[PDB]
């Protein structure tokens, strides 16, 4: 019970999904980056006809075209406006197309005299409206009637006319000029196959498909780990290695034609003579020896090596057969793949149960925490050349690091790959079969020596097994795209030494190698996970940088990091330690933004002020000037108390005032009638009543700031006095100057200019984008009997 409680406490800090195997599905459901196609041009503005008024305030007989936001939904408050623009940035990033084909959006131009087409239907509507307009220039009308698209199918190019606001044109032109599609040919697909599988003679790869020049593809973002999750992220790295281990288990082949379990069990029972001994555990000795255990051991070893997940050794010290098989395990598997405690325990059991007793040496008093392992001490303390040389190899058989095609790889000793070192192992333990065991009871001594010989006499089978395991490891490691970083994980994979005994004693001579389709599936899953990791890093970095540059000081990067971790599909975010979350936040903050996202953000940031000032429901501020100022004459309003700038007035930032809560200065100025300008996105009331202007209601909207100490309810009055007012006769029929003591800092809409809005959008006439490159490769494999290893000899030569 206590062990369960402590392990639960430790596991609650690891964001690994408790049903380990389910991870596989979550790992295999990560699809390639969704390819986005644009259905219509991105537009924020539209032309709109608005009434205009003469200098005397009389409405004219014609409307004028102006640019107006298609969706006017900007909120009040500067912070709220910046949040709106961050949300717009997220929308643009999500809706950003990976490629465009303008021909799909092309529509018939009604007024064209030469069968013209335009992109998009909105452009057609705008062009028709301008064509039917009476104030349009004759030259513009004739141009609309004559402007033509140019389709060059031989060049695979299309140019279409379009009507776009400069901001809309900027966005659409960025989408057109910076498409993610690259040409796809058979050379690219061939180079996409891992370079070590193309050079493997056991796999025959052919290109039985023809790719047209119009074939396109999107390159996966296989940038190595920018967050260095292998360093100082213990729980996240534990989860990553666990998921990798599950995937590697899924792709590891299944052993065939194993030795009969009944025959091997009878042989081992006869050789060991366990019933004749006085061992308190007579039945438990040969338990766990079966084909299922052998397959489990094979899968566990290869998957742990591939995923670089630490393993723990589970063994019963009295079962010396488990220790004898563990000798082979330590011979082949690098000793740094096991948790230090387990390696020390297994090695000390082997030393104190087999090796030192064999040579009459005093049992080793190993001190935990010693920089030397028990085998490292035994190597110096044992003089026999066979056992000492085997111990030396076992001590020095750690993984070697090598970068292949830019990916870090943990590779084995060449003696492991060819299985030659097993001979040394045999040599060593053959010497152990000849030893005297000076003070050991002869029956127990005979049993140990006969078990040692049980493992020894399978020299050929164990050489074949070592070569097969190494070959499978190399082949499946060729399909790994992220660096194989070796770290000691929090939780280990428990490896029963009875399973090692099963593998050693039941492996036959049937070579099994990963199928070409299995290799391609493993490589595709690795590529998809790596690409998704990089894309989500890019998204998180972009959003964090945008929030910081937009000065969204109340935005919580914890939510961004949680979304990033969720989209990685392998993290249970409820179990991520807070310190690791904040470390992830910091490391994400330190990264630079991706070029495409950064450019889109630059566009939004430079056009923010123009987009905000185009809104009809927020003003940029309000000037309270307690002197009478003439209402300006504007075409859009008539008489309007509109301020073109805030020059000559002290400026109080309403966002800072709201955040601080100190209303001393604003209250003092309002009480003392000190002219000021309150700056900030503000909603305003459009009053068309001349009697309201005479009553001076615009000056009665600021005392609530003093009363409530709030600036969210501030709604200044914007007078719009023109002939449509029910009391414009007061302005028209009397000799006076309409004035007011307050002005609303707001801008005027930009007029629609055909010359400035007519663009030529250029794209490709057509192409086809492909996602599964490896589907273009016909992969076959030689007969398993004929499969060879890296040394051009057969993997299993016992035959």
């Amino acid at each position: 019970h206590q062990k369960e409680v402590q392990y639960e406490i430790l596991q609650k800090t690891i964001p690994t999904f408790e049903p380990k195997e389910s991870i596989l599905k979550k790992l295999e459901d990560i699809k390639p980056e969704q390819v986005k196609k644009q259905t219509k041009l991105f537009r924020i503005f539209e032309p709109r006809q608005l009434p205009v008024y003469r200098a005397n305030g009389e409405k004219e007989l014609r409307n004028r075209w102006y640019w107006k936001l298609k969706r006017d939904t900007l909120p009040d408050g500067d912070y709220d406006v910046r949040e709106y623009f961050l949300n717009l940035y997220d929308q643009v990033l999500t809706e950003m197309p990976d490629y465009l084909l303008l021909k799909d959006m092309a529509v018939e131009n009604k007024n064209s005299r030469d069968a013209g087409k335009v992109v998009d239907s909105e452009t057609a509507a705008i062009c028709d409206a301008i064509f039917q307009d009476e104030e349009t220039e004759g030259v513009v009308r004739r141009f609309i009637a004559e402007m033509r698209q140019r389709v060059q199918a031989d060049r695979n190019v299309v140019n279409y006319p379009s009507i776009l606001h400069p901001i809309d044109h900027a966005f659409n032109e960025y989408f057109l000029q910076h498409q993610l599609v690259e040409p796809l040919n058979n050379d690219i697909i061939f180079n996409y196959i891992p370079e070590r599988i193309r050079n493997d003679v056991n796999y025959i790869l052919n290109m039985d498909r023809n790719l047209p020049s119009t074939a396109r593809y999107i390159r996966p973002n296989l940038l190595q780990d920018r967050l260095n999750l292998h360093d100082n992220f213990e729980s996240l790295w534990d989860t990553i290695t666990t998921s990798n281990y599950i995937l590697a288990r899924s792709v590891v082949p299944d052993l065939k034609e194993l030795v009969s379990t009944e025959a091997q069990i009878q042989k081992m029972s006869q050789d060991l003579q366990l019933e004749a001994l006085t061992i308190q555990s007579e039945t438990q000795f040969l338990t766990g020896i079966n084909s299922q255990a052998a397959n489990d051991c094979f899968k566990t070893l290869i998957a742990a090596m591939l995923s670089q997940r630490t393993m723990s050794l589970d063994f019963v010290t009295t079962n010396y057969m488990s220790l004898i098989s563990g000798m082979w395990l330590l011979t082949v598997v690098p000793n740094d793949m096991f948790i230090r405690e387990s390696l020390v325990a297994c090695q000390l059991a082997i030393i104190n149960t087999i090796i030192y007793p064999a040579f009459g040496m005093q049992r080793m008093h190993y001190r935990n925490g010693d920089p030397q392992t028990p085998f490292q001490i035994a190597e110096q303390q044992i003089q026999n050349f066979q056992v000492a040389n085997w111990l030396h190899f076992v001590n020095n058989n750690q993984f070697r690091q090598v970068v292949i095609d830019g990916v870090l790889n943990q590779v084995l000793n060449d003696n492991i790959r060819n299985g030659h070192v097993v001979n040394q192992l045999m040599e060593a333990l053959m010497q152990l079969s000849r030893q005297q065991f000076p003070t050991m009871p002869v029956d127990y001594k005979r049993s140990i020596q006969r078990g040692i010989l049980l493992l020894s006499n399978r020299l050929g089978q164990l050489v074949d097994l070592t070569r097969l395991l190494a070959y499978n490891y190399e082949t499946l490691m060729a399909c790994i795209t992220m660096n194989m970083q070796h770290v000691q994980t929090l939780t280990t994979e428990k490896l029963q030494l009875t399973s090692v005994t099963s593998l050693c004693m039941l492996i036959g001579n049937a070579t099994v190698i990963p199928s070409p389709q299995t290799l391609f599936h493993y490589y595709n899953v690795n590529v998809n996970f790596h690409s998704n990791y990089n894309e989500r890093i890019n998204d998180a970095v972009a959003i964090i940088t945008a929030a910081n540059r937009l000065n969204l000081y109340q935005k919580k990067m914890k939510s961004i990091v949680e979304d990033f971790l969720k989209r990685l599909q392998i993290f249970d975010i409820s179990r991520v330690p807070d310190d690791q979350m904040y470390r992830l936040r910091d490391r994400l903050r330190l990264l630079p933004v991706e070029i495409r996202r950064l450019d889109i953000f630059n566009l939004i940031l430079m056009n923010m002020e123009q987009i905000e000032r185009a809104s009809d429901k927020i003003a940029q501020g309000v000037i309270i000037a307690y002197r009478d100022m003439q209402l300006e004459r504007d075409e859009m309003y008539g008489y309007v108390n509109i301020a073109r700038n805030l020059d000559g007035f002290q400026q109080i930032n309403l966002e800072e005032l709201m955040r601080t809560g100190d209303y001393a200065q604003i209250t003092n100025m309002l009480l003392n009638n000190q002219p000021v300008a309150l700056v900030g996105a503000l909603p305003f009331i459009t009053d068309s009543s001349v009697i309201s202007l005479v009553a001076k209601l615009d000056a009665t909207v600021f005392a609530q700031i003093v009363k409530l100490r709030k600036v969210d309810t501030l709604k200044p009055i914007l007078y719009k006095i023109n002939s449509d007012s029910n009391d414009f006769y007061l302005v028209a029929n009397y000799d006076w100057v309409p004035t007011s003591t307050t002005k609303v800092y707001k801008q005027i809409p930009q007029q629609f200019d055909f010359r400035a809005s007519m663009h030529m959008l250029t794209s490709n006439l057509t192409f086809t984008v492909y996602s599964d490159l490896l589907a273009f490769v016909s992969a076959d494999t030689v007969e398993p009997i004929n499969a060879v290893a890296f040394d051009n000899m057969r993997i299993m030569n016992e035959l």
């Binding site: 900027a170 032109e173 000029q177």
Partner: protein
């Protein structure tokens, strides 16, 4: 002085780097700095003085920003940029001449022309960038 140098360096870099056919990645940061300078200078009125035979000159800034969405710069981009660069270079040259022909005894290291004094305000500090000369 730092803001004046930043204006001059931005314009020199615009002349040297904004060339037909060049990748926008070659001028991305330069165009960002140029647009920052435009935004900072827009809406401001400057006057270079009449000391000596130097003429009184009035400068107004109402320039639009440069595009940032082309893969490679073209003739239209270069022409549009040049139209603004010429005016900015003229303004910078006139400010430099106005500052060169003035001296003070009490504080000779401080700016002397009213244009450079205006450019020494906080609002123009955004124009400041690389000071490598």
């Amino acid at each position: 002085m730092d803001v004046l140098y930043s204006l001059s360096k931005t314009l020199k870099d615009a002349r040297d780097k904004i060339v037909e056919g060049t990748l926008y990645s070659n001028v991305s940061d330069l165009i960002q700095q140029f647009n920052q300078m435009i935004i900072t200078m827009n809406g401001n009125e400057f006057q270079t003085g009449g000391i000596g035979n130097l003429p009184i000159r009035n400068w107004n800034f109402d320039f639009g920003l440069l595009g940032t969405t082309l893969l490679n710069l073209d003739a239209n981009y270069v022409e549009t940029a040049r139209n603004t660069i010429d005016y900015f270079v003229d303004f910078v040259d006139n400010v430099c001449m106005d500052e060169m022909v003035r001296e003070s005894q009490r504080n000779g290291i401080a700016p002397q022309s009213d244009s450079l004094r205006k450019l020494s305000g906080i609002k123009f500090k955004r124009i400041n960038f690389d000071n490598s000369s």
